[PDB]
Design a protein around this nucleic acid. Structure first.
Lengths: 100, 735, 249, 716
RNA sequence: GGCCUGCU
RNA sequence: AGUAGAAACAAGGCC
C-alpha cells in the first residue's frame, strides 16, 4: 500500500549540500547503505545518528506527503548505495549520493 | 584483744550484715594473656560430658560431631548431656497444656516482628566476629563488610532492606562454589565452599575479665554476623514466650525478680497447711551451658512452631541447625619465653593442630592431644552443647518447663514443688507432708532435670526451711535485705564526660537510695566523696584553693571574673549545692538562677565546638557494665553544655595494616553529614527507601532552592545557579 | 548554596563519588555507624587515665578559628592533629574553661523553654514544703509506677509523629495526626520553639522525653503519684518517712 | 507488548517507569500493560510540564527551547517521577511554604499562578466518569483536576484549563498517535481493562541446598531427615514417657539430703609452708611521719618543697648502711639510690624555685631497681624453634605459705584511734529538710568516730600515692620521676600539719593493657627494727639512716631510725582501684547506718545519739584469751572500715573466691543457728571449693582463721 | 641520633 | 630482681 520514491541524490563536492526528498503514496525514517555494508540509521521523524548529527535535518510536509533530508557539510563517508526512505515495513528503492 | 569482724555475725544475722562479705572495694581479677587454654578446656569438657553419645562426620564441613541425644541414661551424679527427645517434648507439651495458647500467640507476634523487622536492627549490638577479617569488630562494621562482600559476589537481595531478605541471601551464600574476600597487608582471595561454611559457622573465643566471685578465669564466645539474625528471631520468640510465664525471671529486672520471688514463696508456704512441711533449695546448675545441646533447642522450637506457616518454622529452625554444627576458634594463641636466650615468641592458635608438643606443659599438652581430633582448619567443632549463654531465653524456657512439671497434677503424689528459674540459678520451694515426702520430691526433681541435660550443682546448693534463701546475690530472710556492696563499684566517675559523669553519679546515689536502701547520712557521704573524686579527676577544684594543676589558672580567672560565684558549675570550679533533696535535678538547672548571664550564655552556646550529637539513641544513654551482671544502659538527665564533649579515641589504628578503615570512616562520616544537612531527620528517624544518595540530595536541592526562593534568601541568580549545578553533578554521576 | 557545593566537591573525588552512587538510602544507618572504635569496657579507668594527657578531648575544626592556640602563659588550648577517624581535632580541657570566660556569648533565655522537664522539676522542688520526720517501719511493696510527671498520655511511636511534625514538618510523610490533643500539642510546641536554635536532635529528644509516657517498677510505700515518685528517695526510707508536698500542689 | 516501550519512548522515561515498577515490588513479566499505561501518564506529565516557563510576571513564557539565562523557571513542577518518600517531601514542603492544604493522595504537578496542584490522569475510559471517580477518591479537594481520554476530549471543573490550547492539541495528537499505533500493534483485547488492583504475596523461606543437609545432621540419633523429625513432632503426644525413664533410670541418681548439725561442720584447713610476707605498696603499721605544721590543705602546696622542708625538720642523719638485705637483690644498689635521692633533693634545694615535678637520672642503680631492659625481646617463631629452653610461661599454682601473726596485729592497730583527723570532707548544699539535718548529724558522728583512725590515714596514703603514680606514669612515660609520700592532717589543737613518709621513684610506664605493670621503688622511714619479724620483710631491703629522739619519761629514747626500701609494681587497674579507696568509708558506714536504722525501726525514734554516747549496746568485734570481747558502735565502725581498707589493699582472686565460697557456708551456718533444719547435698565439695582459694595471701588466710574462730564460737 | 602509637 | 598468678608485664612496631 505505501510506495515510496526518493529524489535529490547525486555527485557532490566535500563540504557541499544536498536535499533528499521522498514522495509517498505514519512515522518516517531515512536510512543509508554503503557498498560494503548493511543498513545504517540516519534520521527519523526527530532523531539523528551520531555520524550525521548537526550536519543533517529531517522534515516532512504531511500536505505534500513528502519527507525531506537536508544534508549539509558533506563528507566522503556519507557516500552510500543508497539513501533509502522508509515508512513504519515499507522501503524505498533508494537514491545514490556520492561525496568526493 | 584481737579484732575479728566475722564474730559480728554472732549477734547480727548473716543476711542483715551480708554486705561485709563482699570485697568489692579492690581491683577485680583480670586475665593477662591468651584464652586459648580455657577454650580448649571448655571444648574438651563439653565433649567428655557427652562421651557416650554417637560420633559422625558432617558431609559439608567434614568435622566430627558428637550426638548424645537419646543416649544411655546416666548412672551417676556427674554432669551429663544425654537429654532424651521424648522427655523434653513431653515437658513442652505439659507446659503448653498448663498454659494453653502460649506457643500459638508467641509465634504470631514473632511472625509479625520477623516479617516487619529491618536489617539495621543488627547494628544495635556489641562486638561481633567479622569473618571477612577473622576478628572481632563492632556490629555495624561487620555487617557493612559482610553486605559489601555479598554485593560483590552477586547476593543483593539484602538491598530490599529486610532482615528476612538478608537471611535469604546468607543461606544462598552457603550454596556458592567460590566467594571472594578482601585483605590488606589490597588482595582479593577466593574462599571455596567448605572454607566459607566453616568461616560462617565459627565462633571467636575470648577471656572474660572483671568477673568477681571465683578464683579461676572462664572463656566466652562471640558469633558471626550470618547467624545473628536467626538468633535475634529465636530470642524474640523466647522472650515473647517467657513474658507469659510467671515462673521465669530472665526477661525482667531485679526488683521484678524480688517481687516474683516473694510472691512464689508466700504462695507456696501460705497454701501449705500445718501438716505440710516446706523446704527451699538455693540451687545452682553446674556446667549449665556445656550440657545444653542445640538439637534439643531445635526440637523445642519445632514443637513450639507446630501448625504454623512452613517459612516461619524454617527461619526459626535455621539457628539451632547452625549451632549444632558450630565451630569455635581456639583463641589468640600461646606465648613462649626462652630465658637462656632471653626472648619471647607468640604462636597463633591455628598452629595447635600441627605444632609439636615439646613446648607445652603436661596439662596443656594433654588438652591439645585430646582436642586435636576435633580441629578442622584451625577451629574446633563444638556440636555437643552451647558455649556461653547465647540461648539464655530458651534455657530459661526449659527450666520453667521443669519447674511447672511439678504442679501436683503431674507429680501424682502428696509432694509438689514450684519456684523461680533464671538461667544457671534457681530457687525451688518444695512442700510435702513429711521429710520423706520432701526427700522424694527433691530426688524426683533432680532425676527429671538429669533427663533434660540439666545438672544441679551439689557443691553450690543447699536446702533449708522456707523463709531464708538466696537468688542471684539477692538474700531473702523473711523479706529481701539490701546489700549495697554490688553497686559500690558504680559510685565513682563513670567516665563518659564531665556533665554526664556528674549526672550519672547523682542519679546512681538516688537510685541506690530508692532500691538498695542506702541511708541518708551514707548518701551524703557518698555525695561528698564523689564530688572530691570528680574534682580530683577532671582537675576542676573549688577555685578558691591554691591547688596548682594544669587547669587551675583558667578556672581561677573565671572565678575572679564571675560576680555570683555560687552559680559556677563544679566542672568550672564552683561550689557544690547538691544534697539529698537535689539528687534528681541536673547541675545546670539547679544553678541556673545563680549564674551570671555572660557565663550562662558562654556555657550553653549551641555553636560550641565541643558538643557532638550523633543519633537519638546516643543522646543521654550511657552504657555502664554493672558488677556481677551483663552490660546495661542508663538514661541520665543532663543539659547539653560545653562540658558535654566526647573523649579522644584510641588512635592506635595508624600503626596497623588496617589503616584504610580510618579513611573510609572519614569519607562515610562526611557523606552522612552532607545527607543530614540535606535530610535533617536522618538522625532521629533513620531514612528508608531504595534510591541512592545523590538522587535524593540533588532532587531535594532542586526543590528546596525553588521553594526557599518562593519565600526566602535565594534569588533568581542563585536559584538558576543551583539548578545548573544540580545538572552538573547529574552529568558527573553519569560519568 | 553551600550545601550543594560541598556535595559537588565530594562527587569530584572518585572514592566519595562511588560511595554516594552505590550506597542506597536504607544503608544510611549502617555506614554512619561504620567505625573502628570499639565501645569502651572500662570507661572510668581510661577517663582517669586520659585526663592526665595533654589534649584529651575532641572538638570540631572550627575551634581553631574561635579560640587562640595558647592562653596568656602559653598553655596550649587546642592542637591541629585530627582525631583517628574524624576531621575533629584533639584539644585540651582548658579550651572548655576558656570558652566559659572569654568565648562567644548568646541569649540562653530559651533553654528553660526547651528543657521543660528539668526546669519544671526545679520549680516544683523550690516551692515544696517539708514536714516532720516520723520513724516507723515502712512496708515497702514493689509496684509499677510512671516516673515521668509530664507525659501527655502518648506512647513512644504515638508522640514520635508529633515530634517530627513539630521539628521536621517536611519529613512526616503519609502521617497527618488525627487526634486533636496531638493537634494542640503541635500548635503549642510549634509556636513556642519557632526560632530556637539549640539543635533539631536535642529538641526532638527532649520533646520525646516530655510527652512520651514511661513506666518502671519500684519499691514504694504510699505516694504512687507521678510528682511524689520523683522525690521517692527523699520521702521514703528504710525506717523513716519524710512528709513532703511538691510546689505543684 | 513491551516491544512498544522498547521502540517509542525515550530512555529517561523507561528507566523512571522501571524504578517506579521496582517501587511497589511487583514483577514486570506478569503484567506489563500497567507499565505502559503509567509510563504514558508520566510522559503526559513531562510534556505538559516542560516547554512551559514563567518570569517575574504571571502569564507563563513559553519557549520551545530554554535559552541560556537565569530565566529558566518552570511553569509546572513535577510531583511524580520520584519515590514516595520524596513525593511526600515535596507535598509537605509546598504546603508549608505555600500555606495551602495538604492532599491525602499523590498529586502530579504544582503551579504558581493559581498556587496549587494538578493530578493528571489519562485513562482508557472516557473522561466524564474517571474525573468524578478520582474526585470522590480525593476528599474535599481544592487542587484542580484535569484528565484526557483517547477519544480526544478534555474536561475540568470550573471550566478551567490552565495554559495554552496548542499544548492541549499537542497532548491529544500524542494521544491519538498512541492509539492508532497500537492499531498497528493490536492491544485493545486487554488495553481498556488490564489492571484490576491485585495486591497479594506469600513469604517464602525455603531450606535447600547445603543448608538442608546440615538440617539433616542436626537431629536425634535415630532420625534421617528434618521432614521426618517434624512429622514425628507434630504427631507426638504425651503418653507418660518421663515416668518410664524415671522408673528405668538407676536409683543411684539421687539428691539425698545430708542433715547439717552442730557437729557436722569442721574447721577450714589452712595451707602449710613458709610464713606469709608483706604485699602492701607502703608501710601501714611501721610508718613514720616528718612534719612541718604548715597551714596548707591536702591538695594545696607543692610536693618537693614540702618534702624537703619536712626532712630538714629532722636532725641526726648518719651515713646509711645495710641492716637487713633484700636476700635476692643487690642491696648496694638500694643504698646508692637512697644517697642519690638525698643528693638530688639538695640539688633542688639549691636552685631558684622548687620544680613542681622532678625527673631523676637513669643510673645503672635504678635501671636494675626499676627492671629496665629486662623484658625479653619479641621475635618470630620461625626464627626460634631449635632453642631447647624455649617453652611456655610458668603457669602453675602459686607457692603455698602459712599464716603468720603479724597480719593480725597489723589489723588490730589499723582499727585504733589516733591523735589527728585524717579526713577533711568537702562541702554540701545547706540542709533544708529535717531528714537532711538528721543525716548531717549522723554523718558528723561517724566522721568524729572514724577520722581519728589509722584506716583513714591508710586510705589517704593510698589515694594520694596511687593518684600521683598514675598521673606521673601518664605524663612522664619515659623518664624516672621522684614523688614524695605526703599526707596532710589536723592536730587536736586544730593546727594543720603535713607528713612525709618517704619517697617513690616511678620508672618507665608505657602501659598499654590494663594488666601491664609499672615498676617503682619505694623508700619509707620507720623505727620498727626488722630483726624481730624478718619473715614479714622478705622482699624489702632495710638500711640504717639515722637516730630519732622522742620525748619520753625514760630520759630520752634516742631510738634508731631505719629506711625500708623495696622494688614494687602496680598496673593501671590497680592504680585506679587504689585511688578509689574512699568508698571503704561508704561500705563501712552504710553497714553501721543499716544497723542503726534496723534497730530504730523497732523503737519509733532515731537511736543514733544514744548509740554513740551511752555506748550501752555492744557487738562481738573480737576475741581475747579470756573470751569474746564486745565493743561500742564506734569500734564496730572502725573495725568494718579497717576490713574494707584491707580488702582494697590486699585484693586478689583468692579473696573473691574465698569470700563467695565462705559466704555460702556462713549462710548455711546461719540457717542452722536459726533452727531452719538446713541440709546439704555435698558439703565436702563446698569445703574443697573454699580450701582451694587459700594459697599465699595473708589477708585471705587471716579471713579463713577468723572464719574458723567464728565457727568454733558459734555452733553452741 | 632524628620521627610515630598507646583499648585496634 | 619485682608485679602477678593457670598467663602475662617487666614498651611495640616502622625504618
Amino acid at each position: 500500500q505505501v510506495q515510496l520514491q526518493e529524489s535529490g541524490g547525486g555527485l557532490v563536492q566535500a563540504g557541499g549540500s544536498l536535499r533528499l526528498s521522498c514522495a509517498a503514496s505514519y512515522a518516517m525514517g531515512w536510512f543509508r547503505q554503503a557498498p560494503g555494508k548493511e543498513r545504517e540509521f540516519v534520521g527519523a521523524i526527530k532523531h539523528y545518528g551520531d555520524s550525521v548529527k548537526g550536519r543533517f535535518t529531517i522534515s516532512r510536509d504531511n500536505a505534500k506527503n513528502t519527507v525531506y533530508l537536508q544534508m549539509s557539510s558533506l563528507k566522503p563517508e556519507d557516500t552510500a548505495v543508497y539513501y533509502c526512505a522508509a515508512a513504519g515495513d515499507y522501503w524505498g528503492q533508494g537514491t545514490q549520493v556520492t561525496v568526493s | 584483744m584481737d579484732v575479728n569482724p566475722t564474730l559480728l555475725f554472732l549477734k547480727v544475722p548473716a543476711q542483715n550484715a551480708i554486705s561485709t562479705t563482699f570485697p568489692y572495694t579492690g581491683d577485680p581479677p583480670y586475665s593477662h594473656g591468651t584464652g586459648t587454654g580455657y577454650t580448649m578446656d571448655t571444648v574438651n569438657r563439653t565433649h567428655q560430658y557427652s562421651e557416650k553419645g554417637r560420633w559422625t562426620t558432617n558431609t559439608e564441613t567434614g568435622a566430627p560431631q558428637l550426638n548424645p541425644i537419646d543416649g544411655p541414661l546416666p548412672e551417676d551424679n556427674e554432669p551429663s548431656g544425654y537429654a532424651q527427645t521424648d522427655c523434653v517434648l513431653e515437658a513442652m507439651a505439659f507446659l503448653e497444656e498448663s498454659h494453653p495458647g502460649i506457643f500459638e500467640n508467641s509465634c504470631l507476634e514473632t511472625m509479625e516482628v520477623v516479617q516487619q523487622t529491618r536489617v539495621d536492627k543488627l547494628t544495635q549490638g556489641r562486638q561481633t566476629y567479622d569473618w571477612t577479617l577473622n576478628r572481632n569488630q563492632p556490629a555495624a562494621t561487620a555487617l557493612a563488610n559482610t553486605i559489601e562482600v555479598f554485593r560483590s559476589n552477586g547476593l543483593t537481595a539484602n538491598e530490599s532492606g529486610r532482615l528476612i531478605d538478608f537471611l535469604k541471601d546468607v543461606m544462598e551464600s552457603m550454596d556458592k562454589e567460590e566467594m571472594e574476600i578482601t585483605t590488606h597487608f589490597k588482595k582479593k582471595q577466593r574462599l571455596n565452599k567448605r572454607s566459607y561454611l566453616i568461616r560462617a559457622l565459627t565462633l571467636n573465643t575470648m577471656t572474660k575479665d572483671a568477673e568477681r566471685g571465683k578464683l579461676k578465669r572462664r572463656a566466652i564466645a562471640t558469633p558471626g554476623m550470618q547467624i545473628r539474625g536467626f538468633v535475634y528471631f529465636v530470642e524474640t520468640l523466647a522472650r515473647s514466650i517467657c513474658e507469659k510465664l510467671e515462673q521465669s525471671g530472665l526477661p525482667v529486672g531485679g526488683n521484678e525478680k524480688k517481687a516474683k520471688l516473694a510472691n512464689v514463696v508466700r504462695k507456696m508456704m501460705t497454701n501449705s497447711q500445718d501438716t505440710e512441711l516446706s523446704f527451699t533449695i538455693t540451687g545452682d546448675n553446674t556446667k549449665w551451658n556445656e550440657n545444653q545441646n542445640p538439637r534439643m533447642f531445635l526440637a523445642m522450637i519445632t514443637y513450639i512452631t507446630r501448625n504454623q506457616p512452613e517459612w516461619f518454622r524454617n527461619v526459626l529452625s535455621i539457628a539451632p541447625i547452625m549451632f549444632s554444627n558450630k565451630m569455635a576458634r581456639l583463641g589468640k594463641g600461646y606465648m613462649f619465653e626462652s630465658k637462656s636466650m632471653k626472648l619471647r615468641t607468640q604462636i597463633p592458635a591455628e598452629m595447635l593442630a600441627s605444632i609439636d608438643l615439646k613446648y607445652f606443659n603436661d596439662s596443656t599438652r594433654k588438652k591439645i592431644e585430646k582436642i586435636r581430633p576435633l580441629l578442622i582448619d584451625g577451629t574446633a567443632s563444638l556440636s555437643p552443647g552451647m558455649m556461653m549463654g547465647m540461648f539464655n531465653m530458651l534455657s530459661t524456657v526449659l527450666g520453667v518447663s521443669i519447674l511447672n512439671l511439678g504442679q501436683k497434677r503431674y507429680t501424682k503424689t502428696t509432694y509438689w514443688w514450684d519456684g523461680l528459674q533464671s538461667s544457671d540459678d534457681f530457687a525451688l520451694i518444695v512442700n510435702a507432708p513429711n521429710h520423706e515426702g520432701i526427700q522424694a520430691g527433691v530426688d524426683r526433681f533432680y532425676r527429671t532435670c538429669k533427663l533434660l541435660g540439666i545438672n544441679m550443682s551439689k557443691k553450690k546448693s543447699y536446702i533449708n526451711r522456707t523463709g531464708t534463701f538466696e537468688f542471684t546475690s539477692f538474700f531473702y530472710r523473711y523479706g529481701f535485705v539490701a546489700n549495697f556492696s554490688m553497686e559500690l563499684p558504680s559510685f565513682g566517675v563513670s567516665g563518659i564526660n564531665e556533665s554526664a559523669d556528674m549526672s550519672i553519679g547523682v542519679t546512681v546515689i538516688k537510685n541506690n537510695m530508692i532500691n538498695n536502701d542506702l541511708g541518708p547520712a551514707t548518701a551524703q557521704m557518698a555525695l561528698q566523696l564523689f564530688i572530691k573524686d570528680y574534682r580530683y579527676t577532671y582537675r576542676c577544684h573549688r577555685g578558691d584553693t591554691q591547688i596548682q594543676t594544669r587547669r587551675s589558672f583558667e578556672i581561677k580567672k573565671l572565678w575572679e571574673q564571675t560576680r555570683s560565684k555560687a552559680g559556677l558549675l563544679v566542672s568550672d570550679g564552683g561550689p557544690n549545692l547538691y544534697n539529698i533533696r537535689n539528687l534528681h535535678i541536673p547541675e545546670v538547672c539547679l544553678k541556673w538562677e545563680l549564674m551570671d548571664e555572660d557565663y550562662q550564655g558562654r556555657l550553653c552556646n549551641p555553636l560550641n565546638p565541643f558538643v557532638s550529637h550523633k543519633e537519638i539513641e546516643s543522646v543521654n544513654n550511657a552504657v555502664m557494665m554493672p558488677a556481677h551482671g551483663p552490660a546495661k544502659n542508663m538514661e541520665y538527665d543532663a543539659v547539653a553544655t560545653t562540658h558535654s564533649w566526647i573523649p579522644k579515641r584510641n588512635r592506635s589504628i595508624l600503626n596497623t595494616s588496617q589503616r584504610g578503615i580510618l579513611e573510609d570512616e572519614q569519607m562515610y562520616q562526611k557523606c552522612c553529614n552532607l545527607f543530614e544537612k540535606f535530610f535533617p531527620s536522618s538522625s532521629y528517624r533513620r531514612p528508608v527507601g531504595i534510591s541512592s544518595m545523590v538522587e535524593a540530595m540533588v532532587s531535594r536541592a532542586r526543590i528546596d532552592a525553588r521553594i526557599d526562593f518562593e519565600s526566602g534568601r535565594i534569588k533568581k541568580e542563585e536559584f538558576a545557579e543551583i539548578m545548573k549545578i544540580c545538572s552538573t553533578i547529574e552529568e558527573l554521576r553519569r560519568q | 548554596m553551600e550545601r550543594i557545593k560541598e556535595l559537588r566537591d565530594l562527587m569530584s573525588q572518585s572514592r566519595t563519588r562511588e560511595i554516594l552512587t552505590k550506597t542506597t538510602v536504607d544503608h544510611m544507618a549502617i555506614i554512619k555507624k561504620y567505625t573502628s572504635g570499639r565501645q569502651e569496657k572500662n570507661p572510668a579507668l581510661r577517663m582517669k587515665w586520659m585526663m592526665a594527657m595533654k589534649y584529651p578531648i575532641t572538638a570540631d575544626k572550627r575551634i581553631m578559628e574561635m579560640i587562640p592556640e595558647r592562653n596568656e602563659q602559653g598553655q596550649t588550648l587546642w592542637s591541629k592533629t585530627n582525631d583517628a577517624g574524624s576531621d575533629r581535632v584533639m584539644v585540651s580541657p582548658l579550651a572548655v574553661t576558656w570558652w566559659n570566660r572569654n568565648g562567644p556569648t548568646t541569649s540562653a533565655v530559651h533553654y528553660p523553654k526547651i528543657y521543660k522537664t528539668y526546669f519544671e522539676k526545679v520549680e516544683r522542688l523550690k516551692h515544696g514544703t517539708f514536714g516532720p520526720v516520723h520513724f516507723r517501719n515502712q512496708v515497702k511493696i514493689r509496684r509499677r509506677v510512671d516516673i515521668n510527671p509530664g507525659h501527655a498520655d502518648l506512647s513512644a511511636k504515638e508522640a514520635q509523629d508529633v515530634i517530627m511534625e513539630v521539628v521536621f514538618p517536611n519529613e512526616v510523610g503519609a502521617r497527618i495526626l488525627t487526634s486533636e490533643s496531638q493537634l494542640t500539642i503541635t500548635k503549642e510546641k510549634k509556636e513556642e520553639l519557632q526560632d530556637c536554635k539549640i539543635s533539631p536532635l536535642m529538641v526532638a529528644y527532649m520533646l520525646e522525653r516530655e510527652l512520651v509516657r514511661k513506666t518502671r517498677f519500684l519499691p514504694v510505700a504510699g505516694g504512687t503519684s507521678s510528682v511524689y515518685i520523683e522525690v521517692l528517695h527523699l520521702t521514703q526510707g528504710t525506717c523513716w518517712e519524710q512528709m513532703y508536698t511538691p510546689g505543684g500542689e | 507488548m513491551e516491544d512498544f516501550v522498547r521502540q517509542c519512548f525515550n530512555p529517561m522515561i523507561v528507566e523512571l517507569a522501571e524504578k517506579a515498577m521496582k517501587e511497589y515490588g511487583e514483577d514486570l513479566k506478569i503484567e506489563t500493560n500497567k507499565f505502559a499505561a503509567i509510563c504514558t501518564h508520566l510522559e503526559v506529565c513531562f510534556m505538559y510540564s516542560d516547554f512551559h516557563f514563567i518570569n517575574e510576571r504571571g502569564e507563563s513564557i513559553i519557549v520551545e527551547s530554554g535559552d541560556p539565562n537565569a530565566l529558566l523557571k518552570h511553569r509546572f513542577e513535577i510531583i511524580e517521577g520520584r519515590d514516595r518518600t520524596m513525593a511526600w517531601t515535596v507535598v509537605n514542603s509546598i504546603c508549608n511554604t505555600t500555606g495551602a492544604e495538604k492532599p491525602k493522595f499523590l498529586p502530579d504537578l504544582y503551579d504558581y499562578k493559581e498556587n496549587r496542584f494538578i493530578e493528571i490522569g489519562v485513562t482508557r475510559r472516557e473522561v466524564h466518569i474517571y474525573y468524578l471517580e478520582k474526585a470522590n477518591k480525593i476528599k474535599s479537594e481544592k487542587t484542580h483536576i484535569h484528565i484526557f481520554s483517547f477519544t480526544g476530549e478534555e474536561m475540568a471543573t470550573k471550566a478551567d484549563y490552565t495554559l495554552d490550547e496548542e499544548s492541549r492539541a499537542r497532548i491529544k495528537t500524542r494521544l491519538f498517535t498512541i492509539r492508532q499505533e497500537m492499531a498497528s500493534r493490536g492491544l485493545w483485547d486487554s488495553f481498556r481493562q488490564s489492571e484490576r488492583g491485585e495486591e497479594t504475596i506469600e513469604e517464602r523461606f525455603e531450606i535447600t541446598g547445603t543448608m538442608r543437609r546440615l538440617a539433616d545432621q542436626s537431629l536425634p540419633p535415630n532420625f534421617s531427615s528434618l521432614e521426618n523429625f517434624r512429622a514425628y513432632v507434630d504427631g507426638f503426644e504425651p503418653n507418660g514417657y518421663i515416668e518410664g525413664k524415671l522408673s528405668q533410670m538407676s536409683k543411684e541418681v539421687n539428691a539425698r539430703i545430708e542433715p547439717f548439725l552442730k557437729t557436722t561442720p569442721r574447721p577450714l584447713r589452712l595451707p602449710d609452708g613458709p610464713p606469709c610476707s608483706q604485699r602492701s605498696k607502703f608501710l601501714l603499721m611501721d610508718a613514720l611521719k616528718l612534719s612541718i605544721e604548715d597551714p596548707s590543705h591536702e591538695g594545696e602546696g607543692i610536693p618537693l618543697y614540702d618534702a624537703i622542708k619536712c626532712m630538714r625538720t629532722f636532725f641526726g642523719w648518719k651515713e646509711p648502711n645495710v641492716v637487713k638485705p633484700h636476700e635476692k637483690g643487690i642491696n648496694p644498689n638500694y643504698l646508692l639510690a637512697w644517697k642519690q635521692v638525698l643528693a638530688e633533693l639538695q640539688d633542688i634545694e639549691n636552685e631558684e624555685k622548687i620544680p613542681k615535678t622532678k625527673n631523676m637520672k637513669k643510673t645503672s642503680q635504678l635501671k636494675w631497681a626499676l627492671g629496665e631492659n629486662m623484658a625479653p625481646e619479641k621475635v618470630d617463631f620461625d626464627d626460634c624453634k631449635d632453642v631447647s629452653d624455649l617453652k611456655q610461661y610458668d603457669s602453675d599454682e602459686p607457692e603455698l605459705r602459712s599464716l603468720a601473726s603479724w597480719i593480725q596485729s597489723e589489723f588490730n592497730k589499723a582499727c585504733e584511734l589516733t591523735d589527728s583527723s585524717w579526713i577533711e570532707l568537702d562541702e554540701i548544699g545547706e540542709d533544708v529538710a529535717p531528714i537532711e539535718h538528721i543525716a548531717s548529724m549522723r554523718r558528723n558522728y561517724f566522721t568524729a568516730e572514724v577520722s581519728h583512725c589509722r584506716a583513714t590515714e591508710y586510705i589517704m596514703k593510698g589515694v594520694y600515692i596511687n593518684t600521683a603514680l598514675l598521673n606521673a606514669s601518664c605524663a612522664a612515660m619515659d623518664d624516672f620521676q621522684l614523688i614524695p609520700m605526703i599526707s596532710k592532717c589536723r592536730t587536736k589543737e586544730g593546727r594543720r600539719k603535713t607528713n612525709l613518709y618517704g619517697f617513690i621513684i616511678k620508672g618507665r610506664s608505657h602501659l598499654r593493657n590494663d594488666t601491664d605493670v609499672v615498676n617503682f621503688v619505694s623508700m619509707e622511714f620507720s623505727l620498727t627494727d626488722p630483726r624481730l619479724e624478718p619473715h614479714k620483710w622478705e622482699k624489702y631491703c632495710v638500711l640504717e639512716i639515722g637516730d630519732m629522739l622522742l620525748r619520753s619519761a625514760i630520759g630520752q629514747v634516742s631510738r634508731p631510725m631505719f629506711l625500708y626500701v623495696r622494688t614494687n609494681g602496680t598496673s593501671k587497674i590497680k592504680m585506679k582501684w587504689g585511688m578509689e579507696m574512699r568508698r571503704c568509708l561508704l561500705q563501712s558506714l552504710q553497714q553501721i547506718e543499716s544497723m542503726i536504722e534496723a534497730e530504730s525501726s523497732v523503737k519509733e525514734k532515731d537511736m543514733t545519739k544514744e548509740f554513740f554516747e551511752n555506748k550501752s549496746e555492744t557487738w562481738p568485734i573480737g576475741e581475747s584469751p579470756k573470751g569474746v570481747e564486745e565493743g561500742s558502735i564506734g569500734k564496730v565502725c572502725r573495725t568494718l572500715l579497717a576490713k574494707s581498707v584491707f580488702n582494697s589493699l590486699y585484693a586478689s582472686p583468692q579473696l573473691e573466691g574465698f569470700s563467695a565460697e565462705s559466704r555460702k557456708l556462713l549462710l548455711i551456718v546461719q540457717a542452722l543457728r536459726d533452727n531452719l533444719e538446713p541440709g546439704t547435698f555435698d558439703l565436702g565439695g563446698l569445703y574443697e571449693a573454699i580450701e582451694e582459694c587459700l594459697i599465699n595471701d595473708p589477708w585471705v588466710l587471716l579471713n579463713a582463721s577468723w572464719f574458723n574462730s567464728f565457727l568454733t564460737h558459734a555452733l553452741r
